[PDB]
Amino acid sequence: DVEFDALLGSYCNTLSLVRFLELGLSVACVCTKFPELAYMNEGRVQFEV
Amino acid sequence: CNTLSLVRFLELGLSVACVCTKFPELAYMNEGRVQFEV
């Protein structure tokens, strides 16, 4: 008697690492680096017209 | 604590076209006459 229970398949999907500066909604925002924003109670912006 | 307190502006070009004539320099003046002959 000859018998075997065989293993035939294993597949992984790609996990797409999608950056924020790719999509079309990057246009409306100007993101910029500022550390220590946790330390302020106000860093808030004042503008003329 | 931030900038962007700036807007800019001007208005010319069409500001002479619709005006459709101009005399500058009115001095101390009392009466302006233009007569028509047709």
Curated annotation (Swiss-Prot), chain A:
It is found in: Virion; Host nucleus. Homomultimer. Makes the hexons and eleven out of twelve pentons. Interacts with triplex proteins 1/TRX1 and 2/TRX2; adjacent capsomers are linked together in groups of three by triplexes, heterotrimeric complexes composed of one molecule of TRX1 and two molecules of TRX2. Interacts with scaffold protein; this interaction allows efficient MCP transport to the host nucleus. Interacts with capsid vertex component 2/CVC2. Interacts with the small capsomere-interacting protein/SCP. Belongs to the herpesviridae major capsid protein family. Self-assembles to form an icosahedral capsid with a T=16 symmetry, about 200 nm in diameter, and consisting of 150 hexons and 12 pentons (total of 162 capsomers). Hexons form the edges and faces of the capsid and are each composed of six MCP molecules. In contrast, one penton is found at each of the 12 vertices. Eleven of the pentons are MCP pentamers, while the last vertex is occupied by the portal complex. This is Major capsid protein. It comes from Human herpesvirus 2 (strain HG52) (HHV-2). The gene is MCP.
